[PDB]
Every structure is written in C-alpha cells, then in structure tokens.
Design a binder for this molecule. Structure first.
Ligand SMILES: O=c1ccn([C@@H]2O[C@H](CO)[C@@H](O)[C@H](O)[C@H]2O)c(=O)[nH]1
Ligand SMILES: O=c1ccn([C@@H]2O[C@H](CO)[C@@H](O)[C@H](O)[C@H]2O)c(=O)[nH]1
Lengths: 810, 810
C-alpha cells in the first residue's frame, strides 16, 4: 500500500505464506478450524523471527573475526514495548507480511494488537536504553545490552472509582517468541559470606551461590542486516540448594525472587535489600561474561581497548568495585594497575539531580551482603581523598563533601560519588542538565577533574517514533524528500523549503486529522468514552511526579472550566485534555493527583453547559504501545516541569517529531528544541532556572499568589470545599495543604504565565494554516533529537569507536 | 542395521537430514561450529516431534467426529522416563534417524543419553500409568492421561560416604520439547471459603482461586498412527492475586507451589496439606475439562455412556464428591440422579494392603480446605450406612467398620471406603491381591456388593520393555517368528518349539552376554568401578522398603561371603550382586538399609581372598532409564517380598521378558508368572500367605531362628559387633534391634529356604545350556504380562469400549 513499508514481491509473499502455515501446524500444533487470533499472532511472530536468525548468527560471527572493541550497555531497565512491527520495519518486511496475511484472510494490524509489551522499565531512563539499542545496531557498533529478565515488569494500571489499582504484569503467560534461553552459559553469582586474608591476598568465602541464566533477544539494525544482542539474566537456585525435603525444594524460590519483579519507583530511591541484590546480580554475571569474551581473542593492559562499559545511572555502579575485585583478588594484578584499567573501561550517565532519587546505600547492608565490595570501596575512597587533600591542601570541608562515605544517622555510600571516581567520563543528558551538574551537585568533582565531564543530549529512534507509529506522516515526508532521512534524521531540514507549499500544508494537516480520528475511535472501542475529534488534543503523558507538575495542568483545566461557566455563551477553542501515567505504588501524593484528575472529569465531562467544549480524560495504563498511539494524535505537548528538575525528557522529542506543538518551560531538552526550531515556533513560559534560585534565596510563599490572583483563589476554595468530591468534602486536603505550605516545585509561581501562554495556543489554533506552518517548522528541525546522533557522540567521544552505515552481506 | 527398527529409505533419510539442519539453525539458533551434543539432541528431538503433530491433530479430529466414549485416567503419578527413542520406535523411524545422524557424522545413541527422564512418579504405580498410556494408544482407545506437571520429579540420589543424599531433580532446566503449553484452556480451582445455604441450594463462597494451566504431551500408539494426549496441569496465581506491592508479587509463589514438587513417599501415607491441595487441584481442573468436552457433542443420563474415569489409587478420590458437587450444586440435578451418574462413571484401582499406605485424611483439614466436599462426604456416608443397616439389620459393628468416617483420637476420612462406595468397579492388580481384598480389608464391602470386585493383573509395555531396551533379543525373536508379537505378545508361545534348537540357544545366550558386556562398561565409564562379566548378575532393583526385604538379600550376601572365607579354596559360582533403589527422605530404616548395603561392599569388594568371586554393588539413582539398561543385563531377578505384601509387582515382568530367571516368594504377580511358565522353571521359596497368618496367630519370635541357625547367629553378631563399620561399632544397632524385636516382615522366617533356594540357582548356572533353556521357557510364556492384555480387560469389563488394532490413515 505505502512505499516506506518496502516491496511486496511475489516470491516473498509466497514464501511468507508457506512458513506461516508451517508454524501454525508444527509450532503451534493447531489448524485453521481451531486457531484463535492469538495463534495467528504467534504464527506470524515465528515466521518473522525466522528472517532474523541467519542475520543474527552472522553478525555474531563477524564480530568474532573482526574483533572490534565491544560496547556493554548495563541497565536495570530496558523498556522495549512490542517487537513484531519493529522487526518488520527494520527488515523491510512490512508490506510483504501485510500482503501475505491479507491473502490468508487475516488483518495484520489486528494481530499486532495481541503482542504483550515488554514493560521491563519505568519511564524515560528505561526507554532511552531501548532507543539506544536500536541506534547502536543501526550504526553498526558491536554492542550488547545487559540487564535482568524480570518475570513481572511495570504493573498494569487500572482505575477503579477514579483510583489507581495495580495489577501484576504477567507478560510471559503465553510465551515470548523473541527470546532464546541459553542455559549453557549459566554463571554463579555470590552473596553474604565473609572475607579471609592470606599470604597471597584477600579471599571471599562461605557465600550463597545464586545462578544467572541468560536469555538472548535479537536487536535488528535498520536495513543494514546487523542484529545485535540484548542479554537478560534470570535467577536460578543451584541443585544442592538448601539440600525437611519438601520445604528445601519450595525454598528454591527465595533465590529466584531476585529476578521476579521490576521495582516501580521512578525518580525515587528505595533502599531495599532485594533491590541491591538485583543490582549486584546483573553486574556480577555481566562482568564474568565480559571477561570470558575478552579472554577468547593474561593481558589486561589491552582490556580498555577491547571493552567499554556504560553505566545507565548508578544502578550498576557495583561494576566498579566488582571489576576491581576480579582483577585484584582473582587475576592478581596490583591495585594501581587494576584501577587504571577500571577507570579507562567505565563511564557513567546521570539522569537526575533530585536529591531523593540518588542512591545512598546503608553501610550495614553492604557489609552483610557484599563484605568484600565494602572493603574495596573504603580503599577506593581513601586513595581518592588523598588526591583531593593533595590538590586542595587544608580544605577539610571539601573532603567531607567529596567522600564516597556519608557520615550521619547511619553511614551511607554515595553511589554517584563512586561512579565519578571510577569512570573516565561522566555525562548529563541535556546541555542545561550537564551545566547544572558542573555548577551544583558535582562541582567539587568537576574542579578536581574537569576533563571527565561531558554532555550527550538525549534522543529517540525515528524508526519506532516515526516510521512505525506514524506511517502516514513518514510517507508524505518520503514523497517530497526520499527515504534516506529514516537513518539520517538531519535531512528533515530539507522540509523547510515546503513551509509555504499549499499541498504539503494540506497533507501534514490531513495526517494529523486521520491520526486523531483513529485514536478517537480507539477510545470508544477499547475504553467506551466519546471525544470530539475536532478539538485541540492537549496531552500530558509521562510518569506521575510532583516535579512534572500535572497539578499545574489541572489548575489550567479548572480555569478553562470556571471561565466557560462564567460566560457560557462565549466562544472558546474546544479541547480534549488527556493526561496519563502511572504512579509508583507507595507515592501517596502521586496517587492523589490521579484521583484529582478523574474527579475533575466527573464534573467537567457531565456539565451540559460545557457541552463539547472541554473534555478531561485520564489515559489508563500509559505504556510504550499506548504512547505509539496517542503521540501521533496530539496537537499540544505539555512539558511543564519546574525549571532545573527534568534532566532531559524524551516524550518531548516524540511529540516534536509527530507534529504536535510544545507548551513548556525552559527545562531539560526543551531548551535545545526551541533553539533548533526558533523560539517563535515554541510556546515557552515561566521561570528560568535563575528565577527559581532567586525565589529560593528569599523564600517561596505561596499565600502571596493566592492573595493576588482571584482565579487561583477560587480554584483553591473549590478544592477545599468539596466542589470536586461532594461526598468527601475534605478529600483533597493534602493537595491543598501541600500547594499552600510545602510545594517544592512552585506550582503557583508559574500559574499566571501558564494560563496566558495557553491563550496564545488557542489563538494560533483558530488559524489552521498557520498552526500547520508552525508544525512544519518543528518537524523539520527535530533532526538533532535522533538517538543516532546521540550514539554517534557517545561512540566518538566516550567509547573510542567509529560508527558505520554499511550493510553486512545478506 | 536390524530389521525390527524399520526402513531407512533414501527419501526419509534425506528428509530427516534437512529438517535436522533446519532446527539446528532456526530453532536452536546455532551452527555446526558452536553446537554441543546437547544442541544435537534437541535438533533431533524437534525433528522427530515434527512427525507426531500431523498424526496428533488428526487423532483429536477423529474423536471429535466419531464421538466414542472417552477414557480418563487420573493419576498423581506418570513415570514416563525418556521420550525420544520410544517415539522413534512407535513411528518406525529408528533406523532412518540412525542413518540420518550417522551421515551428519553423529552417534544417535550418544544423543539419546542427553535426554532427562521425566521422573513424574515414584515407582510401580507411576510407571504402570506410563505403560497404560502406551497400551491405550496402541489399542486405539480415546484415552486421556490427566495429572500434575511437577516442576521437580523424584529427587536425584547421590551416595556420599555410603549414605543417600537427595538432590532436586530440575528436569526442565534445558526445556522439554515434547510438551505444548496450552494457556488458552486455563481453569480456576477453588480452596478454603465457606458454605452458604439459599432457597435454591448450597453455595461455595469466599474462596481462593488458583489457576490450572494445561500442558499437552503426545502419546504415540505402536505403528497405528494413533496419538493420544497426556494433559498435565501447572499452578498459576491469578493477576489480582494478593493485589505492599513487591511482597504481593513475591507471594504469587504460595499459590504456584501446588505443582512444584512430587511427594517422594512410596507405599506410605503422609497427611500434609500441600499434598491434599495437589490432590484436589488435579481433580478439580480435570473434571471441568471433562464436563466441557462432554457438553460440546443439559443431559447427564448419557454422561456414563460418554465418560469413564479411572482412579489410580485413592489419590484422586476427591473426583467422587467433586462430581457430586458440580452435578448437584451447579447443574442442579437431584441427589439420587447425580449419584447414579457418579457411580456409573467412576471406577477404582487399589495397589496395596499395607495399613500405613492408606489415605486417611483428618477431618479438620477437609473442613478448612474443602468445606463443601466434607458435607457431601457426610451425606454420602449417611446414605451408604443406611444401605448397610438395611442389608445387615442389627450389625452395629459392621456399621462402624464400614463408615467412611473413622472415629478416634482425631476423626479421619477413609478415602478407600469412599472410592468403593462411589465406584461401580474396584480392582486389585494381581489375582492373589484381589482375593486378599475380598477376604481381608474390604470383606464387609464385598459382602454388600460382590459384583463390584474384579481383578486386572498388571502388565508392562513390550515396546519400551523389550523392543526399546533390548533390540538384540527383539531381533532374534523376530528372525524366527516375525514382528507381529510386538503388539500381540501371546505369540511368544511359538518360541516354545525352539527350546531344543541349538542355534536359538546360542543366540539367546549371545544376547545376554552382549548386554552384560555393555552394562559392565557402563559401570566403568559413568561410575568408575570394575565387575567380572562372566559372573551371574544378581539384581534387586525397586524402591527401598522393609516389605521388599532387601535385608533378606543382604543376609544371603553376607552368608556367601562368610562361606568363601571359611573355605577359601573351594569353587563357588561367582556373582555380581547389584541392589538399587531410592529411599523416601524421611524413612529412616530405608536409609539405614542403603548404608548397610554399601558397608557390605566396602568389606566384600576389598577382600583379596574373595577376589573376583563376589561383588556387591549399590546402583545409584535407580530410575526408568537406568532400568532400561540393567534389566536386559540381568541373569537373576530378586522378588522376595513377604507373601501378601507386594500387591503385584511389575519389575518382575520386565525381568521375565528380558531373559533373567526369577528367585521369589509366592507373592503378587509372581504367582501367575510361575503358573504361566511352570513352577519347575521358577525358583520359588518361603512361606505362602497362609504360613504367614499361621505364624501371626501364634506369634513371631525371631530369637527362635537366631538360636537354631548358627550361620544367621554369626551374621547378627558381625552386625552388632562392628565388623561392617569398624569406626562406629554400634552403627547398625537399629537394624539388629528391628530384626530381633519388631520385624513386621519376618526376614528370619524365610532365611533358610532362601539360602537353599539360592544354591539351586548357582547349580543351574553351572550348566549354561540348561540355564538358557529355562530362560527360553520364561520368555516364551511372558505374553500374559503385556499391558495390552491388561488394558483390553479394563476396556471390556470396566469401561465398556472395544479395543481395535486398526491403523488410522497417515
Ligand atoms: O529514576 C529516574 C531518573 C531519571 N529518569 C529520566 O531519564 C531520562 C533519560 O535520560 C530523562 O530524559 C528524564 O529527564 C529523566 O527524569 C528516569 O526515567 N528515572
Ligand atoms: O504407594 C504405592 C502403592 C502401591 N504401589 C505399587 O503399584 C504397582 C502397580 O499396581 C504394584 O505392582 C506394586 O505391587 C505396588 O506396590 C506403588 O508403587 N506405590
């Protein structure tokens, strides 16, 4: 049907059909009379997977012979979403499979909807890891994702009575056809025990052994025949384990619980033992695998020329003392040499500056669980602090601030401080976030070693985030400028010479309309609720957090409502406000915010006076495959974090790419996006970082905004008095109390500018042609936000390897 | 190479090779340079499984259209062993796969050794269930095995320092290519809750739901293209389960523990809740599946014409109140009609008379776990006892003996009494065992309903137990009489006219020699110990139990040893005594017996005076695939249970079929075997059942045998005094104490006759030609012990269906 989806050849379509029928028969043990759509999804899924393996096998063979430097991306999170469509797209099989399945009398899109999301992460950091793997495979790097095969991923969110309910995400119930178990490469991981000293060094003894079994998932590059590996470890008990009898077998579960469930806290640290175990387990099994591959080429001077390890936040920071451990205690290198190898091998990415999100492990935990690693850490700290003392003699305060060991209540280990000391490079994830690291939380570190600190502004893969979710837009872009932009997103600049092209304007606007129609029906079919598709689609989707200021959004919504009710017969640009995201199960405020949003909907959506003019919808179970649907349908993207709090953001980039305009603050990558498109093409409002500091110095008093802004006073009174919850008039006391007395994020400070900026959006929306020309100018300057650009900079400036766009032979 | 192994056609061999290479590539994601033997086993395993599916699909289709009565075999045990060779044999693929794999440069036998045993049972009852499924598929019955998919089967036994150590049997580590998960037919099973009464009947409410997910394993008939189904349920938590958050997800394991491990007690009841849960779970999910298949043809009068349920011991006896429950509470039939349907549907097989093996569930357990089923049981009992009262008015003692409810200490439910009351047929498993049921433990029941009681003497499948484990013997038999005996084992009678054929005598003896050579090397390769292959191979393999009297065997061994030492330079027929079997983890005596046997070996096997004349070996980890190796290699089969205790035995039959002679007591099926071969062709010794009763009436005093038999006195003194354990002189005090003061099994009473009978065996062994002619006479009369005969009688006399030998189309 559409050209960017590839050739439907007569040979290929005929081949696909025969293999589909083969799998239905041999693999699924079914035939046409008893097959459900699920069986059809699987038969297609095995058929498409067949095209990967040949490529997968020769990619691993190529690396064996060429021996390039390997990149190891360690993350506790890989937020992959669905694999089938992405695999078709990267293999150029999409139209052929559509044809093949149409001829068998099936609808391929209906089949895609059956695949479970791999929800092996929380939000932005997990999903960046997914974009990175796609980009790495596309740029031909010999790269491996390593993580944990969680049996349950982020919980499924249901709303019952307006409240979030959590339900276990049993994503493996039906099988995962993409993974290949590899029990032959199972590795021991050790816990507890104690440290013995001998003539020939320290020894770690009396340990419990947990086994780590790997599962490999293929990662296809874009049309280049490269297929890389994402290897995820699963926990397994050894067979003499605990080995009265029945109970011993049942207790094998204690050891396997390591890989059972993903922790659902995002931007918040929770110091639980089970979490530390997961952190050690991924790092222990991964380093053994790394060292094993290295030995199959004695000589560790060359280890940094053959190995790069990227740490995704501090979650795998134990890589650092672990590699010291293996090199010092097992390979018998001296300290100084092992340390040089370590620093040269590891590099660290920070993702946040929020103090509650930083990992600070109690010493009593590490002592019990990892007694040797604690020793190594004390030794790293001592030698590090001697470089500090010697560079800043007499500065005793610097020493306590820079220590990897926090003193106080309970002693803690600051894992960020460890990652900086043991890495040759530390990066933030957007330019402003990188400067903030240098000026604030890591300033001492930066003065010590300026050369370690870099920026690598985040990006998204245009394969998933454009070609896959938005074929309509991809196609019309391809009609004008060719297909080459799919792996060179800079080429979208050529779209600027079409900003005054009448036919392009109508096409860009036609695609948005279609996506809106499609999403509007998806709302009615799968969740039974009605939206006007002619309204502006105002969407905020991201995890629920105080810093992300969904509350700011709520206050605007209430304002629009109170303005309609005051002057009912006045024209207002109609809007569908959609807000979605999961709250971490123990984040009480976040749960309250979800309840507020649905309460606003209960009132606004049933006011006959309001009519079709304002709708508020909470989008349940926001996840990757729901993002692929709502994002193409959006007109307005809300990125309204308090300046200085959103390290980068990546949702923002998805929306710029897919033809929504952005309202947001000068925060994170918003700054670079407005810089690329021009500030006039962006709706910027509110305090800058500097204003926030000015307000902190003198103190934030929210009463001041409540006394001066009668529109805001009225909202608060309505909140306090039971307007939104007539059966529990005091239901929202916590929210009001917080807003009034301890808002760490200054919601009221931005309120006025926000509402005013929002009237400018409605005004531009009244002029469709000029709304669309602004859209064209956003889309055409989103090139910089491709994760291909991001990974090319990591490759040249951190890893020391060169990308290449070159096909391997088929 | 050998004809009973089928055609190696040029088409088939070429096909097998291309599919093997396909699986190695697509399914295993490997190629020739990195493949291990394990990968080769799997590639063959998937290739052979491909030939099953077409047959599997049309067998299930045939049953749908013909609608024959279905047989449902419920068992908590299916002791399957390995599947690959058995599948080749029943499909006639064996020579073709040998060829195909030889041409790829592999050794197929070396590949077969990699397959894990499916050890989903304990011993004789579990393995009978396996023979039955093969026979049922071979005789074309529409039959389903139903059970539990245990994640760990019978433990692997290791001997450390002569003691049994247990190790978890992780049979699924590497995958099971034979099973097909069927998550689409998952069914709820309920526990706990309470009973509510309404206007329209009893209701079971507030229950915990456990989900039962089925796995289907194909069961191929012999060369008839029938493929039946063995369906095994796995336990799964529902998704709102327990649903602070982390702990809720981790606790999903409590529900899944139901299918985690097989209980390892054989001939011994253990009243643990987890066991009762497993019993209910298999019966609850199975009946729903049965009723579902029945509805897809309102009318339950015809249920018994479309459904038969066989209960394998009382482990699934809850089928009876469960079917009452569903029919009465859910389908709303009246009691009397539902009961008639139940009785007409169910039938019950007893496997033992040992009082400690009988299931007697505490009432307080059933009350908590299954409150409704307890009510139904009380109602069954009341109405049953009114038929007793009315048939035997005034007999108050009969009433208390026949009650399903035992009074006493704690009230219990006698599950045997329940199975008899709710079944139209009750059978023993050998003729003598069936008479013993009628005369002793079930006498009251028999006087009430004589017509329920039947016999169905056990059998073994000649596919596994001859063609598969002993191709040598199968072949030479086939040379003389054709192939037809493989599914009509009666034809072995024709072998009698060859008892004086010189060439046959030499062939039968050549096969035994080869099997002995092969097994003797298997001992050196895989367990590093040396045996003379010219010795008589004296083997006792079966679970370790006091009633099986391995101790009797031990006393003979010590006697032979003390006789060699007394007159060292006298000729004795040399022997290799092998004894093997697992002890249940809490059966202290059984563990002591294993230790005794290895202690005897430590002494006997290192006495230079003894030399090559006597060796004692304990065969570690006795299991199905070890039975397939030792049984063909045996000369002497030891079946020496105290008369009246071995319900039937089936090891005995394996040995008769494979050319060993039998020494044993007139117990179980030994009686029918000696009757078939002639008593002169069998080494019978010891008390009969009647002698045992005579000795009980007057009392068993073991001191009497110790005072009169100086050879026995000396053994006991050696035991007591530390001869066999010089570092713990009192190590065996428990065994001696037991033997002397409370032997429920009268080891000494049989000792004299045993030793004398054993000299007769050595004497026949000195004359090879006459030993072999006796062998030929055993083999030729083993026909009756085929499970095809057993199942044909079940079919005609219990189930009301006719067998057929007819091919389905290919
Ligand atoms: O715990 C955390 C800490 C940070 N991030 C996000 O990382 C993304 C990837 O770099 C950023 O774009 C986003 O700003 C940040 O909050 C998370 O998603 N979870
Ligand atoms: O718990 C038990 C009770 C009995 N049997 C055996 O059943 C076989 C099959 O019928 C019999 O041949 C054997 O005598 C009996 O002990 C067991 O294996 N386990």
């Amino acid at each position: 049907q559409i050209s960017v989806r590839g050739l439907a050849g007569v040979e290929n379509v005929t081949e696909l059909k025969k293999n589909f029928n083969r799998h239905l028969h041999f693999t699924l043990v079914k035939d046409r009379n008893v097959a459900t759509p699920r069986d059809y999804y699987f038969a297609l899924a095995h058929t498409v997977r067949d095209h990967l393996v040949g490529r997968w096998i020769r990619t691993q063979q190529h690396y064996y012979e060429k021996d390039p430097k390997r990149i190891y991306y360690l993350s506790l999170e890989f937020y992959m979403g669905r694999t089938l469509q992405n695999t078709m797209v990267n293999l150029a099989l999409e139209n052929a499979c559509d044809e093949a399945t149409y001829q068998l009398g099936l609808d391929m899109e209906e089949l895609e909807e059956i695949e479970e999301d791999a929800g092996l992460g929380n939000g932005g950091l997990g999903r960046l890891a997914a974009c990175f793997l796609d980009s790495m495979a596309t740029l031909g790097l010999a790269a491996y994702g390593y993580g944990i095969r969680y049996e349950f991923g982020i919980f499924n969110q249901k709303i019952c009575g307006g409240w979030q309910m959590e339900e276990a995400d049993d994503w493996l119930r039906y099988g995962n056809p993409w993974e290949k178990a590899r029990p032959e490469f199972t590795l021991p991981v050790h816990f507890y025990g104690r440290v013995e000293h001998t003539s020939q060094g320290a020894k770690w003894v009396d340990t419990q052994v947990v086994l780590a079994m790997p599962y490999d998932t293929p990662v296809p590059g874009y049309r280049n025949n490269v297929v890389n590996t994402m290897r995820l470890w699963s926990a397994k008990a050894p067979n003499d384990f605990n080995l009265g009898y029945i109970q011993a077998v049942l207790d094998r579960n204690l050891a396997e619980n390591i890989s059972r469930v993903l922790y659902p806290n995002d931007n918040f640290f929770e110091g639980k033992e089970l979490r530390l175990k997961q952190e050690y387990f991924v790092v222990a099994a991964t380093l053994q695998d790394i060292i094993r591959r290295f030995k199959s080429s004695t000589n560790f001077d060359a280890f940094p020329d053959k190995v790069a390890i990227q740490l995704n936040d501090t979650h795998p920071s134990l890589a650092i003392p672990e590699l010291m451990r293996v090199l010092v205690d097992l390979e018998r290198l001296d300290w100084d040499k092992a340390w040089e190898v370590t620093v040269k091998t590891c590099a660290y990415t920070n993702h946040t500056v929020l103090p509650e999100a930083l990992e600070r492990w109690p010493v009593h935990l590490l002592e019990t669980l990892l007694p040797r690693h604690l020793q190594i850490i004390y030794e790293i700290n001592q030698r590090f602090l001697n470089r500090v003392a010697a560079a800043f003699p007499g500065d005793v305060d610097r020493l306590r601030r820079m220590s990897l060991v926090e003193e106080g209540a309970v002693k803690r280990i600051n894992m960020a401080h460890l990652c900086i000391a043991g890495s040759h490079a530390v990066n933030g994830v957007a330019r402003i976030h990188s400067e903030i690291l240098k000026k604030t939380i890591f300033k001492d570190f930066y003065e010590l070693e300026p050369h370690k600190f870099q920026n690598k502004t985040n990006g998204i893969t245009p394969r998933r985030w454009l070609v896959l979710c938005n074929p309509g837009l991809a196609e019309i872009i391809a009609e004008r400028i060719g297909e080459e932009y799919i792996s060179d997103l800079d080429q979208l600049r050529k779209l600027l010479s079409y900003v005054d092209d009448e036919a392009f304007i109508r096409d860009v606007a036609k695609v948005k309309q279609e996506n809106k129609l499609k999403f509007a029906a998806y709302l009615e079919r799968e969740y039974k609720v009605h939206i006007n598709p002619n309204s502006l689609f105002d969407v905020q989707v991201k995890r629920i957090h105080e810093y992300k200021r969904q509350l700011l959004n709520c206050l605007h919504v209430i304002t629009l409502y109170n303005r309609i009710k005051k002057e009912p017969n006045k024209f207002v640009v109609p809007r569908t406000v959609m807000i979605g995201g999961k709250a971490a199960p123990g984040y009480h405020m976040a749960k309250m915010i979800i309840k507020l949003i649905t309460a606003i909907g209960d009132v606004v959506n049933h006011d006959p006076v309001v009519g079709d003019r304002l709708r508020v919808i909470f989008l349940e179970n926001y996840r990757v495959s729901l993002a692929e649907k709502v994002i193409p349908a959006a007109d307005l993207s809300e990125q309204i974090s308090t300046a200085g709090t959103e390290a980068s953001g990546t949702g923002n980039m998805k929306f710029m790419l897919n033809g929504a305009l952005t309202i947001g603050t000068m925060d994170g990558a918003n700054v670079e996006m407005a810089e690329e498109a021009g500030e006039e093409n962006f709706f910027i409002f509110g305090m800058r970082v500097e204003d926030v500091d000015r307000l902190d110095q003198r103190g934030y008093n929210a009463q001041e905004y409540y006394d001066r802004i009668p529109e805001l006073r009225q909202i608060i009174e309505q909140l306090s008095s039971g307007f939104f919850s007539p059966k529990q008039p005091d239901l929202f006391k916590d929210i009001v109390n917080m807003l009034m007395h301890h808002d760490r994020f200054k919601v009221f400070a931005d309120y006025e500018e926000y509402v005013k900026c929002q009237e400018r959006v409605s005004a531009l929306y009244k002029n469709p042609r000029e709304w669309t020309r602004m859209v064209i100018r956003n889309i055409a300057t989103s090139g910089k936000f491709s994760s291909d650009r991001t990974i090319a900079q990591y490759a040249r400036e951190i890893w020391g390897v060169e990308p290449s766009r070159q096909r391997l032979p088929a």
